Amino acid sequence: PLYVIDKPITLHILTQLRDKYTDQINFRKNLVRLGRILGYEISNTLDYEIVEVETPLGVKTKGVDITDLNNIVIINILRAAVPLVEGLLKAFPKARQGVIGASRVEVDGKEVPKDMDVYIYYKKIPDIRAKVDNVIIADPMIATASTMLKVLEEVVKANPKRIYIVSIISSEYGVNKILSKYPFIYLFTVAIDPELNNKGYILPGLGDAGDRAFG
Amino acid sequence: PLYVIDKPITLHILTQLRDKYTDQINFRKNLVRLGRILGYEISNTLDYEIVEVETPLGVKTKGVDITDLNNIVIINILRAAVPLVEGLLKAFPKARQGVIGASRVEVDGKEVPKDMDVYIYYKKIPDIRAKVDNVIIADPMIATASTMLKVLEEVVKANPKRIYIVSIISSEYGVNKILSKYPFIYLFTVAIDPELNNKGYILPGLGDAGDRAFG
Amino acid sequence: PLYVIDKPITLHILTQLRDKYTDQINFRKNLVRLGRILGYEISNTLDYEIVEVETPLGVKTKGVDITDLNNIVIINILRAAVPLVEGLLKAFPKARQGVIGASRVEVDGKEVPKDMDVYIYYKKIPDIRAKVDNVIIADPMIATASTMLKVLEEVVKANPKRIYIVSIISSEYGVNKILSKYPFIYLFTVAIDPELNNKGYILPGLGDAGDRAFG
Amino acid sequence: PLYVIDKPITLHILTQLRDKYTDQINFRKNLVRLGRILGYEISNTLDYEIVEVETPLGVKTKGVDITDLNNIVIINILRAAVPLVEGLLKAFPKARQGVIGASRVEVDGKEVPKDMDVYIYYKKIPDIRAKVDNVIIADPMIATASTMLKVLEEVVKANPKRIYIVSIISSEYGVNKILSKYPFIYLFTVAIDPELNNKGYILPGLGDAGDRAFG
Numbered sequence: 076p077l078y079v080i081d082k083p084i085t086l087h088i089l090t091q092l093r094d095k096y097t098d099q100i101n102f103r104k105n106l107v108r109l110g111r112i113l114g115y116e117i118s119n120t121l122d123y124e125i126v127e128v129e130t131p132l133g134v135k136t137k138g139v140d141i142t143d144l145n146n147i148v149i150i151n152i153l154r155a156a157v158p159l160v161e162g163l164l165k166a167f168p169k170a171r172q173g174v175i176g177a178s179r180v181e182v183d184g185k186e187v188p189k190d191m192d193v194y195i196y197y198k199k200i201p202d203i204r205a206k207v208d209n210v211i212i213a214d215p216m217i218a219t220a221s222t223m224l225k226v227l228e229e230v231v232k233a234n235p236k237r238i239y240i241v242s243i244i245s246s247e248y249g250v251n252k253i254l255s256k257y258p259f260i261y262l263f264t265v266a267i268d269p270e271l272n273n274k275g276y277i278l279p280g281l282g283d284a285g286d287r288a289f290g
Numbered sequence: 291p292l293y294v295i296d297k298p299i300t301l302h303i304l305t306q307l308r309d310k311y312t313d314q315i316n317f318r319k320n321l322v323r324l325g326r327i328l329g330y331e332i333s334n335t336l337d338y339e340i341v342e343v344e345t346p347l348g349v350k351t352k353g354v355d356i357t358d359l360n361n362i363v364i365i366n367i368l369r370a371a372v373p374l375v376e377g378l379l380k381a382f383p384k385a386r387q388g389v390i391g392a393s394r395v396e397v398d399g400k401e402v403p404k405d406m407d408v409y410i411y412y413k414k415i416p417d418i419r420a421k422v423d424n425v426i427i428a429d430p431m432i433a434t435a436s437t438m439l440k441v442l443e444e445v446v447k448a449n450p451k452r453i454y455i456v457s458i459i460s461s462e463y464g465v466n467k468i469l470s471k472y473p474f475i476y477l478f479t480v481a482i483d484p485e486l487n488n489k490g491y492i493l494p495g496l497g498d499a500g501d502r503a504f505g
Numbered sequence: 506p507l508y509v510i511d512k513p514i515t516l517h518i519l520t521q522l523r524d525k526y527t528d529q530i531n532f533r534k535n536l537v538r539l540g541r542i543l544g545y546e547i548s549n550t551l552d553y554e555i556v557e558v559e560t561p562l563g564v565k566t567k568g569v570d571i572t573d574l575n576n577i578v579i580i581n582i583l584r585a586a587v588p589l590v591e592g593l594l595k596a597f598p599k600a601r602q603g604v605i606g607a608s609r610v611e612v613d614g615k616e617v618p619k620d621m622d623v624y625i626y627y628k629k630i631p632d633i634r635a636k637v638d639n640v641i642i643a644d645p646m647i648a649t650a651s652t653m654l655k656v657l658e659e660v661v662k663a664n665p666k667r668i669y670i671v672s673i674i675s676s677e678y679g680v681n682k683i684l685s686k687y688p689f690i691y692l693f694t695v696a697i698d699p700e701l702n703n704k705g706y707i708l709p710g711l712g713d714a715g716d717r718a719f720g
Numbered sequence: 721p722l723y724v725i726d727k728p729i730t731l732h733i734l735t736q737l738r739d740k741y742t743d744q745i746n747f748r749k750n751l752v753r754l755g756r757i758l759g760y761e762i763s764n765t766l767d768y769e770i771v772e773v774e775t776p777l778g779v780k781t782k783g784v785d786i787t788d789l790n791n792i793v794i795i796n797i798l799r800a801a802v803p804l805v806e807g808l809l810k811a812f813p814k815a816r817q818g819v820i821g822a823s824r825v826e827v828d829g830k831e832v833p834k835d836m837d838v839y840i841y842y843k844k845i846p847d848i849r850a851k852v853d854n855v856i857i858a859d860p861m862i863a864t865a866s867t868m869l870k871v872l873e874e875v876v877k878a879n880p881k882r883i884y885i886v887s888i889i890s891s892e893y894g895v896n897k898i899l900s901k902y903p904f905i906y907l908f909t910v911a912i913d914p915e916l917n918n919k920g921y922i923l924p925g926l927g928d929a930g931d932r933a934f935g
């Protein structure tokens with residue numbers, strides 16, 4: 076399932092992020108912001124049940140309860156996901172948090188075509204309850220999806236109820252590469268960019284979210 | 291224009307607010323929360339223009355810019371709007387803030403039928419630019435709309451570009467009373483309750499938002 | 506008890522507030538900020554008890570518990586206290602909130618000397634438990650103290666355990682006028698300005714906090 | 721320079737963190753909280769200059785300006801520092817952010833005495849301006865200081881103006897091991913615990929801040 080959250084509010088922030096004349100304080104702050112907005116979108120897609128409450132004037136009345144806000148396992152993909160996951164926690168307070176690190180298998184002869192043999196050098200995920208939890212992998216940029224797919228490779232094994240992916244900008248290539256392989260995946264993103272260059276950088280993109288937000 | 295923002299996320303919070311076993315910290319915090327969510331809805335309805343930005347890799351590209359986030363005049367209707375306006379400011383940072391106080395013309399013989407001759411005892415609004423600003427009157431509860439209409443009576447005179455109304459719960463009666471009189475009004479609300487009793491209290495409602503949030 | 510919280514961090518923000526080239530977003534945001542900082546100062550003066558907790562490795566160990574964070578009644582003095590009280594709530598989540606409005610008894614012949622016969626036109630305070638609660642009246646500016654003293658006049662009657670006053674800038678005159686009358690009062694403030702002019706405006710002051718923050 | 725920020729407000733939160741009956745939402749939230757409080761302490765120790773501003777009524781007047789809030793390089797030591805650094809950013813918005821990962825040189829024969837040959841497997845620090853920046857390394861727990869010293873080993877090389885260390889709980893052993901080696905270091909911490917066991921765990925401590933906050 077593809078969800079392209081391109082409303083005015085989100086395209087407004089996305090524009091600020093794109094703009095290179097946007098300093099670090101603002102670039103970082105916008106990541107957190109979207110995190111909370113896309114965090115809200117995913118919320119309106121989670122499993123909920125109808126409940127009954129009793130108002131003050133004593134009137135038992137129906138209501139909704141997103142019981143699944145109790146089964147959230149967010150997975151922070153360093154280094155740029157951090158700020159994104161910050162805003163995500165504002166929507167999923169009850170989430171356990173996984174941390175993952177991945178590096179392109181250092182080749183030597185610049186090759187990044189469709190695959191840069193990614194490799195995990197850090198992994199710390201809480202227990203994922205099979206067919207119960209809703210895993211949410213966060214990473215602002217999905218370019219060649221080498222990273223994402225490598226992370227998924229491991230998550231899929233846990234067999235959680237649902238698997239969500241939250242990115243700001245993902246590439247034409249990267250979105251199809253993922254969904255074709257894992258069609259049951261709920262992929263949320265704000266914009267889907269046409270192409271990526273021969274270095275794996277997304278175009279038009281927005282530069283390096285990691286350095287833009289940290290350095 | 292009526293906008294009933296009844297998505298799962300908003301009906302979820304609304305349910306917590308309804309529930310009388312919800313303490314003050316949480317009841318108040320949920321008002322602020324919705325304020326920011328309904329603040330986001332109104333944002334996706336504001337006038338924006340297409341802009342062009344230059345990414346880092348040097349790619350001039352299109353984007354949206356809600357220029358109207360610059361022309362916002364929020365109007366806080368004491369006493370319960372305060373918390374609501376708190377979250378609203380998180381969506382409209384550039385807004386000037388009006389403060390208003392209204393009291394039912396103290397009669398003596400309990401009468402609240404369709405009108406309780408409301409009266410303004412406090413008023414402090416910034417300058418409202420005719421046909422430029424977008425006025426946003428905030429008040430969680432719209433019951434008989436005596437208060438709202440009394441406030442509008444004064445705002446309409448300013449002749450702003452648009453006029454929005456943000457309420458959590460508004461009554462069948464109160465919504466129609468307002469829109470029939472002022473059809474051009476963008477009325478945002480989460481739920482619209484069937485009826486109000488003979489004291490002007492909304493049913494099923496959620497009790498007194500003012501005392502629930504303050505006392 | 507006078508507490509002049511003039512540390513670098515607070516004098517830094519106070520300076521920004523003083524500066525007239527500080528827009529509304531920043532001026533307002535700094536009020537909230539100080540609110541939370543002065544909110545922290547008052548916290549280190551509240552009654553607490555020593556407690557014992559059991560760490561994970563199973564080690565019962567001592568700790569402090571500011572039990573009095575449970576007995577807080579904040580009193581928001583319109584119109585400028587609002588933003589200040591916003592940050593104050595971030596330190597005292599468990600506080601009930603009073604709202605008060607006061608106006609100089611509209612004379613005609615500009616007189617503001619030592620007294621401008623203030624008058625309350627709005628009042629909504631929760632129940633204040635005698636000798637239990639710690640009342641905290643918030644108002645960024647204490648000039649002639651006509652407002653403050655008028656508000657206190659009513660609060661003193663409740664006979665709460667303690668009474669705190671949180672202001673950003675208070676005048677030489679206003680501070681002494683209050684403490685001399687009510688010596689048991691814990692008055693917190695960042696700076697105490699030399700004098701106020703013949704209109705009741707503080708000098709050097711920082712202008713109208715109300716219009717600076719709202720309009 | 722040792723700074724033990726053991727005020728009631730900080731010992732209050734520290735107590736909640738110690739307490740094993742404190743869930744994840746609250747344990748994590750308290751880390752962020754302290755981050756902002758200890759972030760404020762360090763602020764009152766930074767180099768500032770006296771400035772002059774012009775109030776509204778037109779009165780040039782003195783003020784303080786912590787110019788050094790412009791030269792902050794925070795260094796997040798995974799995995800627990802994340803939440804701590806979250807609150808730290810609320811005090812140092814203008815900071816560049818370094819990320820570091822360290823692992824005990826996997827031996828085989830449980831030995832952790834005074835040194836567990838630590839090893840860095842991840843490092844991404846922005847440029848540190850020699851004798852200009854104020855580096856702030858964040859890590860809630862300083863036990864044997866193997867991690868801290870290993871991180872410092874690299875930071876010292878940059879020769880920044882000042883080097884701060886922000887921890888919640890640090891051990892008798894770890895504090896002296898660091899300051900003896902690097903006496904010019906400004907070490908901030910809330911509590912200093914007596915001893916650590918033979919596994920490197922602090923006593924009384926508060927358990928694993930990483931798993932307490934993430935899993």
Ligand SMILES: Nc1nc2c(ncn2[C@@H]2O[C@H](COP(=O)(O)OP(=O)(O)OP(=O)(O)O)[C@@H](O)[C@H]2O)c(=O)[nH]1
Binds near residue numbers: 164168322746
């Ligand atoms: N039990 C508990 N939950 C908290 C507390 N603080 C935050 N939370 C939860 O964490 C979520 C996000 O919290 P924060 O990081 O403080 O975010 P925020 O900017 O305050 O956002 P909102 O609280 O939604 O307005 C909230 O929606 C709450 O569900 C706390 O002190 N206690």
Ligand SMILES: Nc1nc2c(ncn2[C@@H]2O[C@H](COP(=O)(O)OP(=O)(O)OP(=O)(O)O)[C@@H](O)[C@H]2O)c(=O)[nH]1
Binds near residue numbers: 379383531
């Ligand atoms: N220029 C400026 N704008 C600010 C500052 N702090 C907040 N704002 C603006 O005010 C809005 C809401 O700010 P806050 O009350 O801090 O809300 P928040 O919980 O931090 O929410 P977000 O900043 O959106 O994540 C933001 O979206 C900003 O546009 C500040 O220090 N400087």
Ligand SMILES: Nc1nc2c(ncn2[C@@H]2O[C@H](COP(=O)(O)OP(=O)(O)OP(=O)(O)O)[C@@H](O)[C@H]2O)c(=O)[nH]1
Binds near residue numbers: 316594596598749752
């Ligand atoms: N039980 C409960 N308490 C909350 C919640 N959100 C906030 N609080 C309390 O309210 C205080 C201030 O909350 P906020 O207005 O969200 O402030 P904040 O900017 O998030 O500040 P901190 O939570 O202290 O980091 C906190 O210190 C909490 O004690 C919530 O969802 N549940």
Ligand SMILES: Nc1nc2c(ncn2[C@@H]2O[C@H](COP(=O)(O)OP(=O)(O)OP(=O)(O)O)[C@@H](O)[C@H]2O)c(=O)[nH]1
Binds near residue numbers: 101810
């Ligand atoms: N220019 C700019 N600075 C911002 C903005 N939002 C936050 N900041 C800065 O970042 C700091 C911490 O911001 P947040 O993470 O929003 O923290 P917060 O809970 O809102 O805390 P306070 O803003 O201090 O009340 C602030 O003190 C500001 O200096 C923004 O929209 N624009």
Ligand SMILES: O=P(O)(O)OC[C@H]1O[C@H](OP(=O)(O)OP(=O)(O)O)[C@H](O)[C@@H]1O
Binds near residue numbers: 178
């Ligand atoms: O889809 P892919 O082509 O794999 O690219 C996406 C990933 O690459 C970048 O991380 P990087 O390794 O540059 O580290 P960073 O997190 O510090 O940016 C980016 O932050 C994503 O994590």
Ligand SMILES: O=P(O)(O)OC[C@H]1O[C@H](OP(=O)(O)OP(=O)(O)O)[C@H](O)[C@@H]1O
Binds near residue numbers: 369436437
């Ligand atoms: O549509 P209406 O029938 O006019 O009712 C709605 C208004 O009444 C209540 O205010 P109240 O006067 O009770 O003061 P409060 O703000 O302290 O609740 C409520 O908070 C609204 O402001």
Ligand SMILES: O=P(O)(O)OC[C@H]1O[C@H](OP(=O)(O)OP(=O)(O)O)[C@H](O)[C@@H]1O
Binds near residue numbers: 584650651705713
């Ligand atoms: O010590 P005093 O001389 O009485 O002055 C202090 C009070 O005066 C101002 O309120 P104002 O009536 O101007 O309304 P405002 O809250 O909108 O600023 C100020 O905001 C204080 O509330």
Ligand SMILES: O=P(O)(O)OC[C@H]1O[C@H](OP(=O)(O)OP(=O)(O)O)[C@H](O)[C@@H]1O
Binds near residue numbers: 797863864868920930
């Ligand atoms: O002073 P030391 O004895 O070196 O111990 C302190 C460090 O050890 C822990 O990290 P850990 O390696 O357990 O990973 P974590 O960050 O996930 O807790 C802790 O979070 C500190 O980072």
Ligand SMILES: [Mg+2]
């Ligand atoms: Mg909060």
Ligand SMILES: [Mg+2]
């Ligand atoms: Mg903010």
